[PDB]
Design a binder for this molecule. Sequence first.
Ligand SMILES: [Ca+2]
Ligand SMILES: [Ca+2]
Ligand SMILES: [Mg+2]
Ligand SMILES: [Mg+2]
Ligand SMILES: [Mg+2]
Ligand SMILES: [Mg+2]
Ligand SMILES: [Mg+2]
Ligand SMILES: [Zn+2]
Lengths: 492, 145
Amino acid sequence: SFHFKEAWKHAIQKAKHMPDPWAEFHLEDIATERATRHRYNAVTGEWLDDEVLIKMASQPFGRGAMRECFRTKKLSNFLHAQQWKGASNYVAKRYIEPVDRDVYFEDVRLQMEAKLWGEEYNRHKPPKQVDIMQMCIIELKDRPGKPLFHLEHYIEGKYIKYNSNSGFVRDDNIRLTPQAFSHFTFERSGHQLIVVDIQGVGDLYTDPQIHTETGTDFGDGNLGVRGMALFFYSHACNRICESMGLAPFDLSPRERDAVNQNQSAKTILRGTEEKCGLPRASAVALEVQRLNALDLEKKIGKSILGKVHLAMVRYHEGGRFCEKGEEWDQESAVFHLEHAANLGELEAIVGLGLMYSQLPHHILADVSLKETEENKTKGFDYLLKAAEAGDRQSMILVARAFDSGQNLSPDRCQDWLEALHWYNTALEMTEPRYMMLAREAEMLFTGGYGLEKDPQRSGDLYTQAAEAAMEAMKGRLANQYYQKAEEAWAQM
Amino acid sequence: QLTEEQIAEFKEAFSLFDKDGDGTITTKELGTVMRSLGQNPTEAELQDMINEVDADGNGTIDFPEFLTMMARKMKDTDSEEEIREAFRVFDKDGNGYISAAELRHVMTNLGEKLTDEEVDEMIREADIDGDGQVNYEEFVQMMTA
Ligand SMILES: [Ca+2]
Ligand SMILES: [Ca+2]
Ligand SMILES: [Mg+2]
Ligand SMILES: [Mg+2]
Ligand SMILES: [Mg+2]
Ligand SMILES: [Mg+2]
Ligand SMILES: [Mg+2]
Ligand SMILES: [Zn+2]
């Protein structure tokens, strides 16, 4: 029934000959202490507390930027001696600067959620499986302060950071598994989160970071969709990503070349790999299909992928992807802004509309595009999309385009019926109201571009404009508007 | 059968739970002591020991009685002290399950000559559940066959 027993026994006996890697630190001579261990169950969302006995070194053997590390022995093996002498070695970690107690508990919550995601990755039969180390909290009740410590089992072997939570990816012999794992978590969660900051020994990972759509849980390391943007800027899809059916993120040409520029006999497939899938593809075309299939009430802002592309735009403009002696990549910035707008981010639609129309714009303020008929057409089409999606500024701009021709698409002509429609739509929203009402009244008085004269409606609109001017405390203007209303009614 | 080093370790533990220093612990403190030793007594076994050591109805458990209970626990170990400790060389994080990645880490640490497919096959053979991991029950069953 078990044709592999002997491999297990080989390993058990070799571990038996193996010495304790911490033998010379003689932790067994330390005075035993009592602590309360808090362990988190991420399926049930429940904490379990119990008592444990530990021997902890008095001095730390290492510290990062945030935490100090202490060698610790968790005491089991009271009745029978440690067969493998290293099975009770643990690392305890304490924050260097004081933190609120719940930061420890949220760090545990993070690590265990990432562990669940590793198990989900393994369920798709990857060529190399992964595992996120379990981590818990120990509280030293007897010590002053009731100090909290993170606790993980010690793992001997070379420690490697495969990627960071800020875009770093190993600039040498890359491994396919950590990167494919991160990408898999982006797709399988439906773009709601990504697990990055992959690091540890082999594929035994520890201290991961999760970026979520909201950005609020999992501590200060949650950079939200900015973190997903940082990941996908540097991510190169490999054979594992493909074998699981992950769609590549749409990178610009320059970004594509930089990613291909960054060798070894890396990890090899086996043929059992299953397709990922809630799950969402990472490519803009498939996401456009998803939004089209969804019964939209002319709805926009429903794409997380578009927000990731927008965060990319803002990182470009901010110099995050620039080396110290270069000019920041405007071309790729506009590429990602286009992708964000086609995925329904209203800020991107308005920004591209203003930019292609040669109008002033906030996003990518210092970027200027060529004045062409194609670009003028694109700018007006974007501004029309923004107006149809509720943006008042674009509404007013489109009205003035159909009115006077300013910033109108060269594919289109002046049209005062359309202009009146857009003026009215903007007016119904809770650039002054009386000015737009008076412009309407003037168009009705005059007529033209498909709009026949209407003296009575013109007088009524001049009257409404005068009343709105009174509401604005512009009495003299209200008198002028009343004069115009009587002037229009006298045309009859 | 108990060594003086084991006895000194138990003395440290007992002193840690004999906080008021009367030389005894109460009968409800004993459960917590035993669970803090990394041992997992069933509530039946626990209640048995409780009523036995407190036959005189005094509530007190001194250190010699605790040591006697530990000696009886050492001989009544369900003769599986080897399999319990052999499980722990593979369950690296100590979460009660051996994962394929953990087994791979061990087989590479200890210089064993298996491929990653052979490691996946050890796991899938021992993993009767089919949940992708090997629990302690499955490890025991694989060992005893
Ligand atoms: Ca484990
Ligand atoms: Ca199983
Ligand atoms: Mg972190
Ligand atoms: Mg926060
Ligand atoms: Mg006492
Ligand atoms: Mg007594
Ligand atoms: Mg006595
Ligand atoms: Zn990928």
